[PDB]
Amino acid sequence: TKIAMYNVSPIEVPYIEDWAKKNDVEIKTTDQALTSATVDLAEGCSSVSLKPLGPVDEEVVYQKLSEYGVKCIGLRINTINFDWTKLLVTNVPVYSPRAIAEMTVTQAMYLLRKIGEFRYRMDHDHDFTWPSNLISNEIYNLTVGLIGVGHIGSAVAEIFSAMGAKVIAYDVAYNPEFEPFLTYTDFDTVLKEADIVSLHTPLFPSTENMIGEKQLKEMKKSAYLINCARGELVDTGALIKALQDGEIAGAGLDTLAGESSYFGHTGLTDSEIPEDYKTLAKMPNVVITPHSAFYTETSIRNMVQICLTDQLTIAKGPRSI
Template structure:
């Protein structure tokens, strides 16, 4: 058996090599993300894995089908960059890694919330100007006196709920699917109640056409003026223009963003800051906004697990088995 891994980083290589040696499987690694321009690299391989960051169109799946490849193992949770209908049409089974480390992403969301709750960005902005004062506008609230609202309580949302409950917060949750195991940690309710009552609103839902811009102008107007929005899920869940307006007009108090809607347009290093989008520039200059470059997942455990789960799935499907991580 031979596998090809696209978009391999230096950090991933040791884990991939260890898995290949353990399973006695030949693996080739390339740094480029999978696209139609390089899909022919997969010729002669039995299976493929990719990071899944950039969009893939039908031509890629058609090429796989022609090569006799019938699976694609994505090494992350999100599959919004995959055309699932086109993949099914060409008999390509796509798997994702739904739970490589829910705790890693949950901890990043809580970290951002605590940073914003205690107004650290505002204090740092003042201190950079020589102002070491505090006043009524920066007084904070302990987390156990807060109500946290979770939009989506799957693996990551569930882990987030457990952390906030351990800190003493009241946790409200909105999800289309009920999970009885989360009853000790959350109170299930509707989306409007979450938006109206929560001091911290944390997003943990996939990006689909039905969830794109689910947090927009109307939703911001429902929130408390003291509310903090946390998005460690997908940038497209939030209408960026509406977010900027809500922050500028003090409709909400702050935002923690590990992902932005147009982040693919500026991933990587930019020596010329003028290349960055205007909305990023506006948000990054706000002391009540904390932006990180989509790194909530980025822990040693998460990297190892994402590789091992994805490659195990590739092997299982090639050998005629069925994985629980198949994306329907």
């Protein structure tokens, strides 16, 4: 049984070949996306594997899939037209909650210890002293509020709770297994009481610009906001005003609304990076990362491997469908 992959990064190659030989299956691969100009690669193979940057819209692709004997399209991550599929589809729902959880905790502690602000003072003011307004506090004295708790949210809960912090959380769905780490409560109580506020809900119309002006004035003036989820959750202009006028103390971001313009590209002009990024990027009480929270070996390993072991059980008779 043969498999054909698409969208592969050099970092993904070792784990493919490490699996190919382990599960004794022949594998053909390529960095380019699946289109009508690259379906021919799927001759023989039981399954195609993709990690899409965009819609696979054109639909002779699907025709050609099932004519070649492809049993399944398995994604490594809504970019699939579900009507043409009626082949089985799969996805990778969970690869590493702890990767994103760990970035969340990291960015929150950095800000809390006010490291960005000390380095500004040191490097721009040549000022190595300890001002009253830069005093810190221990995590166990603080309380962390989570907006949404799923796979990622709860891991964030388990970590902070392990460090002695009180965690409180608003979700539309009650999970009892999470009760050892957090107290469920309403949205508003989360914003009011919380010393760190961290976003872990999905992206939907009802969830777009969830955090804007109202919400930021509702937070504690000493609080930090953390978004390691999706940029469209935060109204950026509002964030930026809130930060200037000091309605919060800081922000840690792994993502921004309208980020696809420049996140993932290289060699950009000043003119091709937006001014809102340049503004946040300059604030000592902000930290930004290029949507990298997911980026550990475990994530790369499981994105590739979970999907291929899926594909082998479909070349015979799993929950990923």
